[PDB]
Every structure is written in structure tokens, then in C-alpha cells.
Amino acid sequence: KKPRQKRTATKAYNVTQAFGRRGPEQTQGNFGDQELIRQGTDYKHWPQIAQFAPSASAFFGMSRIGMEVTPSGTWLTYTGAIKLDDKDPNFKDQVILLNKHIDAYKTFP
Amino acid sequence: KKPRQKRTATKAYNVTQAFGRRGPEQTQGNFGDQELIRQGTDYKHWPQIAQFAPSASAFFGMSRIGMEVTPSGTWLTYTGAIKLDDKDPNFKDQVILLNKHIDAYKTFP
């Protein structure tokens, strides 16, 4: 189907199916509690997470972009940081929501 | 206008105006030669670059997401990698196009 970076997780094709298991390794995603993992973009608070994701123009404009070649193939690398607005009246709710998903897999039964 | 991560660069609002000057530091973008800097999404080969940009779902599914509280504010950190298809006949040209823009800023004021 679609290249991995263009996939959209849903209830029918979830975060694990599209992007693999959450874990600690540099190759793994770490974001998502059990609800977000099974629902993807169907998750009730998805829009509040998607407001932090970069447009294509911002992805290539804000990030440090590189190319790394490994035994698995050729990779476009990306790093960066998005500053939350502490004058956003939703700031405190945004922190709480991001805190619920970052490394949430560590607590899974 | 838009938050930084949702901005769209164009000739009318360019990569420097939207995302700041290219540079070597951690929250400095390093991507784009003078033509892409000037034109943003009006760049003639923008679709060949944007094919590698992640969906919101993939950005939060693939990336390693962190939160840092520093003297400057609260930051959402992100790292990851997007696999190129080395079997795509277009692979060689994709690599040339990306490398044209990665760290181009080092060659001009």
C-alpha cells in the first residue's frame, strides 16, 4: 500500500499495523497510549495531537534533514523541536495530553 | 499568523521568512538551496521533496517524541527516519535532489 510516511492510522488499520510497535529503540515510535494505538486518527483527541504535526513545507523548513545509509537501506533523517505557546489558553491541557502518550507503552500490561 | 509547524513557504512568504535562516544548530533548519529558500512550495521540484514529508499520523507514529522544559519554554522534540525505496528506478534522482538541498547554506552567505 502507501509509503509508510504517507499512511493514516485508523481503527481499521491501527498505529501498530501502520508504524510498528511502540518501544525504546531509535528505529521505533514511542508515542501513543493503548487508545490512540488502536484508534489512530479515529482517536477522540486526535485533532489536539495533529495541531503539533508539521506541514510538508515546515517539515523540510524547520527540521535538521540528513541522509544515513545502514544495512537496511537509505534513510532520510529528521530532528527538531516545536515550541509550545504558554499563552495558548489550552497550554495546560496540551501538556497533559502529550504527557499521556509520550512513552505510554512503558506502562502497558 | 499560523503556528510555525503549520506554515507554508511560497515566493510571497519564503523559507527564511517562515522558518528562519538555514544553519548548523539543533533548532535551525539546514534544508534548501537558494532557489528552494526563495520559492518554498512554488519550487519546480517541490512534489519530489514533499513525497517524503510525513502525514500527521505518520509523524506521531514513526517519530521519537519528547517534552523538555527549559529557560526558553516547553518544547516538543522529535527525531526519526523515512526509508527511501532503493528499488524505485527514480531512487538515484531522489537522492541527488535531497543532497542538493541538505546543508546547501554552507556554500553561500
PDB file of C-alpha atoms in Angstrom:
ATOM      1  CA  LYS A   1       0.000   0.000   0.000  1.00  0.00           C
ATOM      2  CA  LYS A   2       1.143   3.654   0.617  1.00  0.00           C
ATOM      3  CA  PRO A   3       4.753   4.510   1.567  1.00  0.00           C
ATOM      4  CA  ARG A   4       4.966   4.350   5.414  1.00  0.00           C
ATOM      5  CA  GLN A   5       5.321   8.176   5.843  1.00  0.00           C
ATOM      6  CA  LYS A   6       2.002   8.749   3.908  1.00  0.00           C
ATOM      7  CA  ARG A   7      -0.061   6.155   5.915  1.00  0.00           C
ATOM      8  CA  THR A   8      -3.033   7.287   8.067  1.00  0.00           C
ATOM      9  CA  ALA A   9      -3.748   5.009  11.068  1.00  0.00           C
ATOM     10  CA  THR A  10      -7.473   4.337  11.850  1.00  0.00           C
ATOM     11  CA  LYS A  11      -9.452   1.706  13.805  1.00  0.00           C
ATOM     12  CA  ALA A  12      -9.313  -0.442  10.611  1.00  0.00           C
ATOM     13  CA  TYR A  13      -5.505  -0.029  10.182  1.00  0.00           C
ATOM     14  CA  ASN A  14      -4.076   0.989  13.539  1.00  0.00           C
ATOM     15  CA  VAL A  15      -0.845   2.644  14.710  1.00  0.00           C
ATOM     16  CA  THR A  16       0.884  -0.771  15.279  1.00  0.00           C
ATOM     17  CA  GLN A  17      -0.159  -2.060  11.801  1.00  0.00           C
ATOM     18  CA  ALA A  18       0.950   1.203  10.059  1.00  0.00           C
ATOM     19  CA  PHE A  19       4.038   2.209  12.068  1.00  0.00           C
ATOM     20  CA  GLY A  20       5.040  -0.853  14.201  1.00  0.00           C
ATOM     21  CA  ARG A  21       5.098  -1.436  17.942  1.00  0.00           C
ATOM     22  CA  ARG A  22       5.985   1.361  20.378  1.00  0.00           C
ATOM     23  CA  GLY A  23       9.406   0.859  22.029  1.00  0.00           C
ATOM     24  CA  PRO A  24      12.709   2.374  23.263  1.00  0.00           C
ATOM     25  CA  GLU A  25      14.893   1.683  20.132  1.00  0.00           C
ATOM     26  CA  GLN A  26      15.990   4.551  17.830  1.00  0.00           C
ATOM     27  CA  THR A  27      14.056   2.819  14.947  1.00  0.00           C
ATOM     28  CA  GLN A  28      10.711   2.622  16.909  1.00  0.00           C
ATOM     29  CA  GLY A  29       7.985   5.243  17.553  1.00  0.00           C
ATOM     30  CA  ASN A  30       7.447   5.931  21.331  1.00  0.00           C
ATOM     31  CA  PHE A  31       4.133   7.899  21.136  1.00  0.00           C
ATOM     32  CA  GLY A  32       0.632   6.616  21.948  1.00  0.00           C
ATOM     33  CA  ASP A  33      -1.321   5.062  24.813  1.00  0.00           C
ATOM     34  CA  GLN A  34      -3.439   1.931  24.126  1.00  0.00           C
ATOM     35  CA  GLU A  35      -6.488   4.026  22.974  1.00  0.00           C
ATOM     36  CA  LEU A  36      -4.532   6.113  20.388  1.00  0.00           C
ATOM     37  CA  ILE A  37      -2.639   2.973  19.165  1.00  0.00           C
ATOM     38  CA  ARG A  38      -5.954   1.089  18.423  1.00  0.00           C
ATOM     39  CA  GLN A  39      -7.898   4.157  17.053  1.00  0.00           C
ATOM     40  CA  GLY A  40      -5.234   6.279  15.226  1.00  0.00           C
ATOM     41  CA  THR A  41      -6.963   9.313  13.603  1.00  0.00           C
ATOM     42  CA  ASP A  42     -10.318   7.945  14.939  1.00  0.00           C
ATOM     43  CA  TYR A  43      -8.983   8.789  18.485  1.00  0.00           C
ATOM     44  CA  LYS A  44     -11.356  11.314  20.185  1.00  0.00           C
ATOM     45  CA  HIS A  45      -8.432  13.798  20.911  1.00  0.00           C
ATOM     46  CA  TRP A  46      -6.563  13.231  17.571  1.00  0.00           C
ATOM     47  CA  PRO A  47      -7.021  16.893  16.342  1.00  0.00           C
ATOM     48  CA  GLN A  48      -5.352  18.188  19.553  1.00  0.00           C
ATOM     49  CA  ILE A  49      -2.269  15.992  18.726  1.00  0.00           C
ATOM     50  CA  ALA A  50      -2.350  16.721  14.919  1.00  0.00           C
ATOM     51  CA  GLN A  51      -2.043  20.544  15.623  1.00  0.00           C
ATOM     52  CA  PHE A  52       1.657  19.860  16.536  1.00  0.00           C
ATOM     53  CA  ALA A  53       2.477  17.819  13.368  1.00  0.00           C
ATOM     54  CA  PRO A  54       4.361  19.803  10.678  1.00  0.00           C
ATOM     55  CA  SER A  55       3.027  20.697   7.186  1.00  0.00           C
ATOM     56  CA  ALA A  56       5.327  19.316   4.417  1.00  0.00           C
ATOM     57  CA  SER A  57       6.822  22.857   3.998  1.00  0.00           C
ATOM     58  CA  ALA A  58       7.501  23.124   7.809  1.00  0.00           C
ATOM     59  CA  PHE A  59       8.871  19.514   7.928  1.00  0.00           C
ATOM     60  CA  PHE A  60      11.571  20.486   5.410  1.00  0.00           C
ATOM     61  CA  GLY A  61      11.831  24.103   6.669  1.00  0.00           C
ATOM     62  CA  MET A  62      12.181  23.591  10.455  1.00  0.00           C
ATOM     63  CA  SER A  63      13.942  20.208  10.716  1.00  0.00           C
ATOM     64  CA  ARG A  64      17.578  19.124  10.514  1.00  0.00           C
ATOM     65  CA  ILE A  65      17.480  16.835   7.450  1.00  0.00           C
ATOM     66  CA  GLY A  66      20.142  14.232   6.675  1.00  0.00           C
ATOM     67  CA  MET A  67      20.798  11.010   4.760  1.00  0.00           C
ATOM     68  CA  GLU A  68      22.099   7.868   6.586  1.00  0.00           C
ATOM     69  CA  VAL A  69      22.849   4.505   4.870  1.00  0.00           C
ATOM     70  CA  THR A  70      22.562   1.362   7.005  1.00  0.00           C
ATOM     71  CA  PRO A  71      22.373  -2.408   6.318  1.00  0.00           C
ATOM     72  CA  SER A  72      18.530  -1.882   5.915  1.00  0.00           C
ATOM     73  CA  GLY A  73      18.868   0.806   3.174  1.00  0.00           C
ATOM     74  CA  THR A  74      18.923   4.605   2.645  1.00  0.00           C
ATOM     75  CA  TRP A  75      17.130   6.833   5.210  1.00  0.00           C
ATOM     76  CA  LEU A  76      16.069  10.490   5.242  1.00  0.00           C
ATOM     77  CA  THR A  77      16.771  11.545   8.852  1.00  0.00           C
ATOM     78  CA  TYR A  78      14.923  14.381  10.615  1.00  0.00           C
ATOM     79  CA  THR A  79      15.244  16.104  14.016  1.00  0.00           C
ATOM     80  CA  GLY A  80      13.851  19.292  15.511  1.00  0.00           C
ATOM     81  CA  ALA A  81      11.786  20.881  18.267  1.00  0.00           C
ATOM     82  CA  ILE A  82       8.407  22.640  18.287  1.00  0.00           C
ATOM     83  CA  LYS A  83       7.945  25.280  20.999  1.00  0.00           C
ATOM     84  CA  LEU A  84       4.558  25.132  22.788  1.00  0.00           C
ATOM     85  CA  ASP A  85       2.875  28.539  23.264  1.00  0.00           C
ATOM     86  CA  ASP A  86       2.463  29.080  27.051  1.00  0.00           C
ATOM     87  CA  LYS A  87      -0.034  31.947  26.209  1.00  0.00           C
ATOM     88  CA  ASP A  88      -2.277  29.383  24.407  1.00  0.00           C
ATOM     89  CA  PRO A  89      -5.277  29.038  26.777  1.00  0.00           C
ATOM     90  CA  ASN A  90      -5.126  25.242  26.075  1.00  0.00           C
ATOM     91  CA  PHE A  91      -1.410  25.043  27.082  1.00  0.00           C
ATOM     92  CA  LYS A  92      -2.123  23.092  30.335  1.00  0.00           C
ATOM     93  CA  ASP A  93      -4.468  20.606  28.564  1.00  0.00           C
ATOM     94  CA  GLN A  94      -1.886  20.182  25.729  1.00  0.00           C
ATOM     95  CA  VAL A  95       0.843  19.296  28.265  1.00  0.00           C
ATOM     96  CA  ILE A  96      -1.481  16.795  29.994  1.00  0.00           C
ATOM     97  CA  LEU A  97      -2.468  15.179  26.642  1.00  0.00           C
ATOM     98  CA  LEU A  98       1.131  14.895  25.326  1.00  0.00           C
ATOM     99  CA  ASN A  99       2.191  13.505  28.817  1.00  0.00           C
ATOM    100  CA  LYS A 100      -0.495  10.767  28.444  1.00  0.00           C
ATOM    101  CA  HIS A 101       1.067   9.456  25.171  1.00  0.00           C
ATOM    102  CA  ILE A 102       4.878  10.052  25.384  1.00  0.00           C
ATOM    103  CA  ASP A 103       6.472   6.631  26.266  1.00  0.00           C
ATOM    104  CA  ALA A 104       2.979   5.426  27.419  1.00  0.00           C
ATOM    105  CA  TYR A 105       3.941   1.851  26.178  1.00  0.00           C
ATOM    106  CA  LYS A 106       6.270   1.505  29.270  1.00  0.00           C
ATOM    107  CA  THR A 107       3.073   1.148  31.462  1.00  0.00           C
ATOM    108  CA  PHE A 108       1.118  -1.302  29.200  1.00  0.00           C
ATOM    109  CA  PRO A 109       0.026  -4.523  30.966  1.00  0.00           C
TER     110      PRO A 109
ATOM    111  CA  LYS B   1      -0.124  34.083  11.534  1.00  0.00           C
ATOM    112  CA  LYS B   2      -0.045  30.226  11.642  1.00  0.00           C
ATOM    113  CA  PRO B   3       1.964  28.437  14.337  1.00  0.00           C
ATOM    114  CA  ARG B   4       5.486  27.715  12.926  1.00  0.00           C
ATOM    115  CA  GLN B   5       4.830  23.970  12.267  1.00  0.00           C
ATOM    116  CA  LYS B   6       1.716  24.726  10.132  1.00  0.00           C
ATOM    117  CA  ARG B   7       3.253  27.488   7.933  1.00  0.00           C
ATOM    118  CA  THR B   8       3.513  27.048   4.127  1.00  0.00           C
ATOM    119  CA  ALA B   9       6.536  28.718   2.429  1.00  0.00           C
ATOM    120  CA  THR B  10       5.867  30.293  -1.042  1.00  0.00           C
ATOM    121  CA  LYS B  11       7.522  33.011  -3.197  1.00  0.00           C
ATOM    122  CA  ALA B  12       5.305  35.523  -1.269  1.00  0.00           C
ATOM    123  CA  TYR B  13       6.358  34.119   2.160  1.00  0.00           C
ATOM    124  CA  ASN B  14       9.688  32.346   1.777  1.00  0.00           C
ATOM    125  CA  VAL B  15      11.595  29.672   3.754  1.00  0.00           C
ATOM    126  CA  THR B  16      13.689  32.340   5.594  1.00  0.00           C
ATOM    127  CA  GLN B  17      10.535  34.401   6.392  1.00  0.00           C
ATOM    128  CA  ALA B  18       8.546  31.305   7.589  1.00  0.00           C
ATOM    129  CA  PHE B  19      11.260  29.148   9.221  1.00  0.00           C
ATOM    130  CA  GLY B  20      14.323  31.363   9.761  1.00  0.00           C
ATOM    131  CA  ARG B  21      17.759  31.360   8.106  1.00  0.00           C
ATOM    132  CA  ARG B  22      19.359  27.946   7.419  1.00  0.00           C
ATOM    133  CA  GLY B  23      22.111  26.992   9.867  1.00  0.00           C
ATOM    134  CA  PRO B  24      24.034  24.262  11.721  1.00  0.00           C
ATOM    135  CA  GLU B  25      22.400  24.395  15.229  1.00  0.00           C
ATOM    136  CA  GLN B  26      19.750  22.000  16.702  1.00  0.00           C
ATOM    137  CA  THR B  27      16.553  24.100  16.032  1.00  0.00           C
ATOM    138  CA  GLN B  28      17.942  25.602  12.824  1.00  0.00           C
ATOM    139  CA  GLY B  29      16.651  24.148   9.550  1.00  0.00           C
ATOM    140  CA  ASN B  30      19.579  23.024   7.320  1.00  0.00           C
ATOM    141  CA  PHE B  31      17.490  22.149   4.194  1.00  0.00           C
ATOM    142  CA  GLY B  32      17.313  24.106   0.949  1.00  0.00           C
ATOM    143  CA  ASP B  33      19.470  25.782  -1.705  1.00  0.00           C
ATOM    144  CA  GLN B  34      18.868  29.465  -2.612  1.00  0.00           C
ATOM    145  CA  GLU B  35      16.150  28.519  -5.195  1.00  0.00           C
ATOM    146  CA  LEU B  36      14.062  26.424  -2.729  1.00  0.00           C
ATOM    147  CA  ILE B  37      14.670  29.003   0.043  1.00  0.00           C
ATOM    148  CA  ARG B  38      13.232  31.711  -2.336  1.00  0.00           C
ATOM    149  CA  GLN B  39      10.272  29.686  -3.675  1.00  0.00           C
ATOM    150  CA  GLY B  40       9.133  27.228  -0.933  1.00  0.00           C
ATOM    151  CA  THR B  41       6.204  25.127  -2.209  1.00  0.00           C
ATOM    152  CA  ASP B  42       6.373  27.065  -5.571  1.00  0.00           C
ATOM    153  CA  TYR B  43       9.745  25.256  -6.173  1.00  0.00           C
ATOM    154  CA  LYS B  44       9.502  23.373  -9.544  1.00  0.00           C
ATOM    155  CA  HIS B  45      10.528  20.026  -7.872  1.00  0.00           C
ATOM    156  CA  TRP B  46       8.588  20.561  -4.578  1.00  0.00           C
ATOM    157  CA  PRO B  47       6.424  17.430  -5.264  1.00  0.00           C
ATOM    158  CA  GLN B  48       9.599  15.238  -5.450  1.00  0.00           C
ATOM    159  CA  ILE B  49      10.653  16.559  -1.971  1.00  0.00           C
ATOM    160  CA  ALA B  50       7.122  16.544  -0.383  1.00  0.00           C
ATOM    161  CA  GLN B  51       6.663  12.812  -1.252  1.00  0.00           C
ATOM    162  CA  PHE B  52       8.989  12.208   1.792  1.00  0.00           C
ATOM    163  CA  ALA B  53       7.062  14.519   4.202  1.00  0.00           C
ATOM    164  CA  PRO B  54       5.017  12.540   6.784  1.00  0.00           C
ATOM    165  CA  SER B  55       1.243  12.678   7.371  1.00  0.00           C
ATOM    166  CA  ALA B  56       0.221  13.887  10.868  1.00  0.00           C
ATOM    167  CA  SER B  57      -0.497  10.205  11.716  1.00  0.00           C
ATOM    168  CA  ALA B  58       2.952   9.039  10.474  1.00  0.00           C
ATOM    169  CA  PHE B  59       4.742  11.965  12.199  1.00  0.00           C
ATOM    170  CA  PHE B  60       3.301  10.824  15.609  1.00  0.00           C
ATOM    171  CA  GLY B  61       3.542   7.082  14.678  1.00  0.00           C
ATOM    172  CA  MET B  62       7.161   6.915  13.384  1.00  0.00           C
ATOM    173  CA  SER B  63       8.942   9.625  15.416  1.00  0.00           C
ATOM    174  CA  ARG B  64      10.578   9.602  18.848  1.00  0.00           C
ATOM    175  CA  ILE B  65       8.667  12.367  20.673  1.00  0.00           C
ATOM    176  CA  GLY B  66       9.977  14.166  23.791  1.00  0.00           C
ATOM    177  CA  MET B  67       8.999  17.095  26.007  1.00  0.00           C
ATOM    178  CA  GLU B  68      11.633  19.447  27.534  1.00  0.00           C
ATOM    179  CA  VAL B  69      11.030  22.387  29.901  1.00  0.00           C
ATOM    180  CA  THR B  70      13.941  24.854  29.620  1.00  0.00           C
ATOM    181  CA  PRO B  71      14.519  28.571  30.363  1.00  0.00           C
ATOM    182  CA  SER B  72      13.163  29.342  26.807  1.00  0.00           C
ATOM    183  CA  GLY B  73       9.894  27.395  27.236  1.00  0.00           C
ATOM    184  CA  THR B  74       8.313  23.966  26.780  1.00  0.00           C
ATOM    185  CA  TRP B  75       9.476  22.101  23.683  1.00  0.00           C
ATOM    186  CA  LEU B  76       8.101  19.074  21.803  1.00  0.00           C
ATOM    187  CA  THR B  77      11.253  17.323  20.447  1.00  0.00           C
ATOM    188  CA  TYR B  78      11.060  14.899  17.502  1.00  0.00           C
ATOM    189  CA  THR B  79      13.520  12.541  15.763  1.00  0.00           C
ATOM    190  CA  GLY B  80      13.075   9.844  13.136  1.00  0.00           C
ATOM    191  CA  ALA B  81      13.936   8.496   9.707  1.00  0.00           C
ATOM    192  CA  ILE B  82      11.992   7.819   6.474  1.00  0.00           C
ATOM    193  CA  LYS B  83      13.143   4.874   4.374  1.00  0.00           C
ATOM    194  CA  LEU B  84      13.785   5.648   0.661  1.00  0.00           C
ATOM    195  CA  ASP B  85      12.870   2.848  -1.800  1.00  0.00           C
ATOM    196  CA  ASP B  86      16.303   1.825  -3.235  1.00  0.00           C
ATOM    197  CA  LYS B  87      14.384  -0.439  -5.750  1.00  0.00           C
ATOM    198  CA  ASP B  88      12.423   2.555  -7.230  1.00  0.00           C
ATOM    199  CA  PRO B  89      14.056   3.395 -10.606  1.00  0.00           C
ATOM    200  CA  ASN B  90      13.661   7.109  -9.513  1.00  0.00           C
ATOM    201  CA  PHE B  91      15.776   6.436  -6.331  1.00  0.00           C
ATOM    202  CA  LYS B  92      19.100   7.807  -7.752  1.00  0.00           C
ATOM    203  CA  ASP B  93      17.432  11.138  -8.794  1.00  0.00           C
ATOM    204  CA  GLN B  94      15.603  11.404  -5.407  1.00  0.00           C
ATOM    205  CA  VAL B  95      18.979  11.080  -3.609  1.00  0.00           C
ATOM    206  CA  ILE B  96      20.572  13.770  -5.914  1.00  0.00           C
ATOM    207  CA  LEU B  97      17.614  16.131  -5.268  1.00  0.00           C
ATOM    208  CA  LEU B  98      17.711  15.720  -1.438  1.00  0.00           C
ATOM    209  CA  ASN B  99      21.556  16.123  -1.345  1.00  0.00           C
ATOM    210  CA  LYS B 100      21.302  19.300  -3.466  1.00  0.00           C
ATOM    211  CA  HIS B 101      19.302  20.886  -0.565  1.00  0.00           C
ATOM    212  CA  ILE B 102      20.873  19.272   2.562  1.00  0.00           C
ATOM    213  CA  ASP B 103      23.411  21.783   4.001  1.00  0.00           C
ATOM    214  CA  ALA B 104      23.362  23.923   0.755  1.00  0.00           C
ATOM    215  CA  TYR B 105      23.546  27.043   3.065  1.00  0.00           C
ATOM    216  CA  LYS B 106      27.230  26.178   3.857  1.00  0.00           C
ATOM    217  CA  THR B 107      28.135  27.332   0.267  1.00  0.00           C
ATOM    218  CA  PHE B 108      26.628  30.886   0.464  1.00  0.00           C
ATOM    219  CA  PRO B 109      26.389  33.787   2.935  1.00  0.00           C
TER     220      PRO B 109
END
